[PDB]
Design an enzyme around this catalytic site. Structure first.
Site, mmCIF file in Angstrom:
data_model
loop_
_atom_site.group_PDB
_atom_site.id
_atom_site.type_symbol
_atom_site.label_atom_id
_atom_site.label_comp_id
_atom_site.label_asym_id
_atom_site.label_seq_id
_atom_site.Cartn_x
_atom_site.Cartn_y
_atom_site.Cartn_z
ATOM 1 N N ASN A 114 51.319 41.362 31.637
ATOM 2 C CA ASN A 114 50.246 40.361 31.687
ATOM 3 C C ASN A 114 50.881 39.015 32.038
ATOM 4 O O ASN A 114 51.984 38.705 31.597
ATOM 5 C CB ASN A 114 49.552 40.272 30.315
ATOM 6 C CG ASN A 114 48.355 39.313 30.292
ATOM 7 O OD1 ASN A 114 48.136 38.637 29.286
ATOM 8 N ND2 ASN A 114 47.563 39.279 31.362
ATOM 9 N N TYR A 149 40.480 28.817 33.201
ATOM 10 C CA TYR A 149 41.110 29.349 32.009
ATOM 11 C C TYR A 149 41.574 28.228 31.111
ATOM 12 O O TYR A 149 42.125 27.241 31.576
ATOM 13 C CB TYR A 149 42.316 30.188 32.472
ATOM 14 C CG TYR A 149 43.163 30.755 31.367
ATOM 15 C CD1 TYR A 149 42.751 31.885 30.669
ATOM 16 C CD2 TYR A 149 44.373 30.159 31.013
ATOM 17 C CE1 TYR A 149 43.509 32.398 29.649
ATOM 18 C CE2 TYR A 149 45.138 30.670 29.992
ATOM 19 C CZ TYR A 149 44.695 31.785 29.312
ATOM 20 O OH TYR A 149 45.442 32.271 28.267
ATOM 21 N N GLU A 167 40.184 31.305 23.496
ATOM 22 C CA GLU A 167 40.680 31.434 24.870
ATOM 23 C C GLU A 167 39.401 31.608 25.693
ATOM 24 O O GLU A 167 38.624 32.535 25.428
ATOM 25 C CB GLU A 167 41.553 32.684 24.980
ATOM 26 C CG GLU A 167 42.215 32.911 26.348
ATOM 27 C CD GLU A 167 43.058 34.177 26.370
ATOM 28 O OE1 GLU A 167 42.624 35.196 25.808
ATOM 29 O OE2 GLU A 167 44.172 34.171 26.950
ATOM 30 N N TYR A 216 37.130 31.638 29.566
ATOM 31 C CA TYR A 216 37.173 31.994 30.973
ATOM 32 C C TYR A 216 35.868 31.762 31.713
ATOM 33 O O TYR A 216 34.795 31.958 31.145
ATOM 34 C CB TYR A 216 37.384 33.511 31.091
ATOM 35 C CG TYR A 216 38.710 34.059 30.656
ATOM 36 C CD1 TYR A 216 38.933 34.445 29.337
ATOM 37 C CD2 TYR A 216 39.702 34.284 31.586
ATOM 38 C CE1 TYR A 216 40.119 35.046 28.963
ATOM 39 C CE2 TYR A 216 40.880 34.880 31.229
ATOM 40 C CZ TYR A 216 41.085 35.262 29.920
ATOM 41 O OH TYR A 216 42.270 35.884 29.586
ATOM 42 N N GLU A 222 45.160 35.481 36.836
ATOM 43 C CA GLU A 222 45.662 36.272 35.709
ATOM 44 C C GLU A 222 45.737 37.720 36.168
ATOM 45 O O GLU A 222 44.842 38.193 36.863
ATOM 46 C CB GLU A 222 44.737 36.184 34.477
ATOM 47 C CG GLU A 222 45.141 37.213 33.421
ATOM 48 C CD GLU A 222 44.538 36.998 32.044
ATOM 49 O OE1 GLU A 222 43.742 36.058 31.868
ATOM 50 O OE2 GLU A 222 44.885 37.781 31.131
#
Length: 185
Positions: free
Chosen positions: A35, A69, A78, A80, A172
């Site tokens: 990742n 992000y 977090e 998005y 990402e």
């Protein structure tokens, strides 16, 4: 606007060749990764910022997201705003939709368990998502009016933290390969 933050994080798997270009431009070539998240933006996010970008190249060969992000602390979240993706469209618990910048986005929430966070180490945290229903074409000057997302999220009880961390237009990837070239302003 001038970007003042360069995000280049990888869990160490595979190859992630991230280039910090001039101004708000950056590129990434990745192969057989774990990742990673790479992008340019601002050191301190704002719920009032209007983000502009142009992805000259968006060529994921697998799981990858072209997405706004960022993070907040207190609480740790977090978030998005996904405009395009590769082979997998991210989804979660459906909350509703929001129309913004010419597109319709589904709103989802998910939770990560014992996962790496902005502070390092591992913890459990919530993720807020606005995912476009269809991929946004790339190669053009695109706008993400973040305030529309923050407001729609608030209407569904998805409140952001009070301490704002970075906010970037990112690439990402997860166990995939591909290429991207994006300019942010």
């Amino acid at each position: 606007a001038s970007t003042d933050y360069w995000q280049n994080w990888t869990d160490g798997g595979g190859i992630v060749n991230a280039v910090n270009g001039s101004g708000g431009n950056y590129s990434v070539n990745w192969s057989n990764t774990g990742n990673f998240v790479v992008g340019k933006g601002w050191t301190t996010g704002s719920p009032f910022r209007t983000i502009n970008y142009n992805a000259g190249v968006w060529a994921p060969n697998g799981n990858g997201y072209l997405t706004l992000y960022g993070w907040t602390r207190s609480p740790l979240i977090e978030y998005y705003v996904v405009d395009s993706w590769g082979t997998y469209r991210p989804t979660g618990t459906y909350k509703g939709t929001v129309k913004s910048d010419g597109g319709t986005y589904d709103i989802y929430t998910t939770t990560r368990y014992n996962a790496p966070s902005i502070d390092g180490d591992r913890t459990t945290f919530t993720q807020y998502w606005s995912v476009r229903q269809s991929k946004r074409p790339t190669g053009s000057n695109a706008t993400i009016t973040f305030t529309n997302h923050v407001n729609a999220w608030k209407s569904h009880g998805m409140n952001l933290g009070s301490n704002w961390a970075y906010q970037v237009m990112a690439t990402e990837g997860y166990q995939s390969s591909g290429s991207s070239n994006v300019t942010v302003w």
